[PDB]
Amino acid sequence: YNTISITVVDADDVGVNFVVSKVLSTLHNKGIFNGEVGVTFPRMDKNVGDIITLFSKTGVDRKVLTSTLNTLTDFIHIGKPKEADKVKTYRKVDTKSKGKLIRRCIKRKGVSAETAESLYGNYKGEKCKLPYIVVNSKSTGQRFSMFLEECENSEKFNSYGLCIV
RNA sequence: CUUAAAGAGUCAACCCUUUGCUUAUCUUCCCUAUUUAAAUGUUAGCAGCCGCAUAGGCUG
C-alpha cells in the first residue's frame, strides 16, 4: 500500500508530541481518515515518535493534506508518496478508572451507588504504560490521553487512523 | 620455686545553730544586596455505548 510521511520538525519550543497530537487533531477534523486511511509511527520506543505515516490504499496526495495541515506548516515536513508492502498498524486501547464503570453499574444493572462501590472496591485500577497521544475531543468537551499499541492489520479503520476489531 | 612458705581487724556513733549584698549607671553612632531566568519531562490517562463481566471491542 502506498504511503506518505508527515514529520514534525522544529518543535523544540513546543514539545514534539504536542505538534504530533495537533497533527492528529487537524487530520481528524478536516476529514482525511474517512474509513480507510490509517496511521503508523516508525519510532515508538517510549515516545510516540515524530513521524505520522498515512498508508491509504487508494492513495494520498501531497496537495490535499498540505492544504489540510496549513496550520502546522511552520514546523511540518511532508515527504513524497512512497510505497510499502507492509505497514505496522496500531489500534486504540482505552483505560477505565473507578467511577467510569461505577456509572455503568448505575445505568446497566440499576443498582445503588453504595453497592456499586461494593462490587468494585477491591477491583479495577489498571495502568497503561503504552506510548500515547493527547487528544482534544470536540464532540465530548474534554481532552484526554489515547493509547496506541501493535495489533494485526484490519481492513477498516476509524476516523483517527487506528484499526477496527 | 619469687624477703618463697602463713595469717579474719573487728565494733560504735545527733555537727550544730544564727544570719539584710546592698548601692547608681546614656551603648551609639554609619549604611545600595544587587542583575538574570522556558519548568520541561506527551503532563494526561477521560466522557458513552456494545455488551453478563470490574473479559473483550467501538465512539471522539
Nearest one of A83, A91, A78 to A52, comparing CA atoms: A78
Protein CA at A42 to nucleotide C1' at B15, angstroms: 104
Long-range contacts of A106-113 (CB under 8 A, 24+ apart): none
Nearest nt (C1') to A136 (CA)? B60
Q: What are phi and psi of A13, to 5 degrees?
A: -60, -35
Protein CA at A44 to nucleotide C1' at B11, angstroms: 101
Residue A89 CA to residue A122 CA, distance in Å, equals 35
Protein CA at A156 to nucleotide C1' at B48, angstroms: 22
Interacting residues of A159 by C-beta distance below 8 A, sequence separation 6+: A28, A33, A34, A35
By the 10 Å C-beta count (0-12 exposed, 13-18 middle, 19+ buried), A87 is classed as middle
Contact A146, A132 (CB under 8 A): yes
Q: Is the sign of the CA dihedral A131, A144, A160, A26 positive or negative?
A: negative
Residue A7 CA to residue A76 CA, distance in Å, equals 6
Set of cell numbers at residue A163: 484499526
Could you tell me the resolution of this structure in angstroms? 2.9
Nearest nt (C1') to A123 (CA)? B54
Nearest nt (C1') to A48 (CA)? B42
